[PDB]
Amino acid sequence: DIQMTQSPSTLSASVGDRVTITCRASQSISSWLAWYQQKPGKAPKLLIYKASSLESGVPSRFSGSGSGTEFTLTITSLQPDDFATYYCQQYDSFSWTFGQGTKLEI
Amino acid sequence: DIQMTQSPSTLSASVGDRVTITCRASQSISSWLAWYQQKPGKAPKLLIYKASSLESGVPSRFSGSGSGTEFTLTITSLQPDDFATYYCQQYDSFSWTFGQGTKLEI
Amino acid sequence: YNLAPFFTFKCYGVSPTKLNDLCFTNVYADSFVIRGDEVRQIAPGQTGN
Amino acid sequence: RDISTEIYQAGNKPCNGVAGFNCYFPLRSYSFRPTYGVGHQPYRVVVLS
Amino acid sequence: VQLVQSGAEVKKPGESLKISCKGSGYSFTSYYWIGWVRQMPGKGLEWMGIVYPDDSDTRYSPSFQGQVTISADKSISTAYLQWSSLKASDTAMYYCVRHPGGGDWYFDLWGRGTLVTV
Amino acid sequence: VQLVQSGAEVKKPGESLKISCKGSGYSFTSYYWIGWVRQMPGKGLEWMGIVYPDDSDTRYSPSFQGQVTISADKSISTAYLQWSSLKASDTAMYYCVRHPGGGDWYFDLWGRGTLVTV
């Protein structure tokens, strides 16, 4: 059971800022992390798969990077809808595990 | 084909009486007998399966017993619901056959 | 290999290079003319008019 | 184990990524799909030597 | 969780006819054996046949073998009883039935019935 | 290309709980792994299990294995999450999720959600 730690637990940044979120793995995964947008009371929507490519319907402002244990999710310019919970999950091996989640505030 | 003979052809009894319909098979059929009840103008209703186990939604007063050639369907107390034709169907072997039937009457 | 500048030579069950090394029991050549976008339709298990 | 990615220079003339006639990439994708038949469905092979 | 059967059809002898029954309210319809049982008016129940909708496998009774044609379509979960050249004796109620698999071959569900009149 | 889940419902402890997810808008529905994810109130997502509708193969997380039973009705393109012995810990909102094939094991499609409170 690969363990994911997502830092920071909560982040507050002004609109238009660049925000970075770190997902750390207990053991190395070969670029098999996925990033999801969950708005309050909503279904998580896939942004990023393979930690590099982004899902259709996701603007280019959202981006991802990293490999191995360390992965990063970055927004260059924030938007009102952008602020919400973010999740990272490994799919390198089964018994898939999610991150705790990062709540984004203005 | 296994032949089911059902006795008696017509039986008349009052409400609250106890009746014991009998069904006999040409060959031994273990406990693979089903007892059905059909009201006139209505589809038959499964009452007994495995020759002793009542179908769900059927009054508990119905009971079945016997194995091999002899099979007994016993009703402790009769009601107007109980007054309908009764059939015995063997499902031990293919080419399934039904008994001639018993016309339970007031 | 001298037929047209950019011919599409697509072999199923064999290799383009290996054809000269093989013996064939029965050979049939089927010739027709189609639109270019419909060329991909000429393949095993494809959908098109 | 061969991990060569160089273009196969089948022709005597050079094939440096030209991908023309007698010039082609060595590795081809399986393109597995569940719709394929059992023969074409993927099989995982472990060889214990 | 019950079977819906088509309305009564009246035809003169010598005409082809097909009677349809579709189960509804229960899952895995194609994996339940669906049968036809004939009851002559004022007579005992007679099992006609059974069909497996998933693979269209039929096991007719010897009495009705070579005469009825029971088939099924899993797309609409509907079992069809096709009778060709209706004879005079072919004037009886037809019940669509469902019975479970395994050792439990008893007809737990019965259709309302069709008044086929010839 | 959506997954419609059963309506959110409230049940007392000890009852049998069944949640239905039907997939629409994409062909070959039986060939897509369909799974369930649990979100506790004020908690992160927890993957629970997946099923292959064609062959009914099931995979479970170690925590949820045995506790849950996940099934697939391929005939009606549906997946069911079945819980026995509902308890207070069994209070969360559940997502029906779809997997792409091959080596991509993220959840590309998510259902609207099914809150269950005990």
From Swiss-Prot, chain D:
It comes from the Viruses. Disulfide bonds join 15-23. Residues 1-25 are annotated as: Disordered. Changing residue 10 to V: Increased resistance to neutralizing antibodies. Binds to host ACE2. RBD also interacts with the N-linked glycan on 'Asn-90' of ACE2. Cleavage of S generates a polybasic C-terminal sequence on S1 that binds to host Neuropilin-1 (NRP1) and Neuropilin-2 (NRP2) receptors. Interacts with host integrin alpha-5/beta-1 (ITGA5:ITGB1) and with ACE2 in complex with integrin alpha-5/beta-1 (ITGA5:ITGB1). May interact via cytoplasmic c-terminus with M protein. May interact (via N-terminus) with host bilirubin and biliverdin, thereby preventing antibody binding to the SARS-CoV-2 spike NTD via an allosteric mechanism. Attaches the virion to the cell membrane by interacting with host receptor, initiating the infection. The major receptor is host ACE2. When S2/S2' has been cleaved, binding to the receptor triggers direct fusion at the cell membrane. When S2/S2' has not been cleaved, binding to the receptor results in internalization of the virus by endocytosis using host TFRC and GRM2 and leading to fusion of the virion membrane with the host endosomal membrane. Alternatively, may use NRP1/NRP2 and integrin as entry receptors. This is Spike protein S1. It comes from Severe acute respiratory syndrome coronavirus 2 (2019-nCoV). The gene is S.
